[PDB]
Structure 1
Amino acid sequence: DEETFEEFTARYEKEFDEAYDLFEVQRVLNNCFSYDLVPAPAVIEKALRAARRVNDLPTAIRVFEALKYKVENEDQYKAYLDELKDVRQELGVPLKEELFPS
């Protein structure tokens, strides 16, 4: 309802900046997914950067699963494809190709 993405986006990155442990990472990510605002690739990249800061690969797996299934959004796929591949091959957190065939 006529709410700017930029303010809350910047809040998400700035909270990710001072992520001391995984608790604030978890709470901020849950709040971000709480809105209907589908996360941007930039905020997901910042979240993965915070997760790499806190060193818990399961957070990365969970957020990838959340991106794959968060909202129907008229069943858009290629957006999901790019938003996953850019952040997979930006630095490397190889996690999707193992839980699926198990």
Structure 2
Amino acid sequence: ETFEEFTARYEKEFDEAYDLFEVQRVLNNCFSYDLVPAPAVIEKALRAARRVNDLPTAIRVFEALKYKVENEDQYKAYLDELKDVRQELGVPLKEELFP
């Protein structure tokens, strides 16, 4: 219900990924609540994206937080911490990609 028990409970439910649509469904519903996601939740999200053998959902989580990030300042802060996380990940921005 609060911030921290949310983070703990759905990271525990989130390391039960094992699959494509399972990790994508738990990403959907754990993203669609009434709180911004914790950075630890998105680190487990990128690690589960490495586990489930799929790259474009690791792009999709970033445009999802680009919508939900509610300002530009938290967006640049997430760009910083998620930037050196990308350097240890290998995932591109859409703005770096131009489809």
The TM-score by the shorter chain falls in which range? Answer: 0.7 to 0.9
Q: How big is the shift at 1:27?
A: 1.4
1:37-66 alpha-carbon deviations (Å, 9 max, x no partner): 111111001011111100110110100111
Percent identity between matched residues is 100
Checking the alignment, whether the CA contact within 8 Å between 2:14 and 2:23 is kept in structure 1 is: yes
Give yes or no for contact 2:19–2:52 (8 Å, CA) kept in 1. Answer: yes
Aligned length: 99
Aligned-residue CA RMSD in angstroms? 2.3
Deviation track 1:49-86 (CA, whole Å, cap 9, x = no partner) reads 11110011011010011111125247643323224214
TM-score by length of 1: 0.77
Alpha-carbon distance, 1:15 to partner: 2.1
- Following superposition, the deviation at residue 11 of structure 1 comes to 2.1
| Secondary structure, aligned partner of 1:99 | coil
Structure 2 residue runs without a partner (length 5+): none
Calculate the TM-score normalised by the size of structure 2.
0.79
For structure 1, the 5+ residue unaligned runs are none
Higher helix share: 1
1 CA distance for matches of 2:34 and 2:50? 26
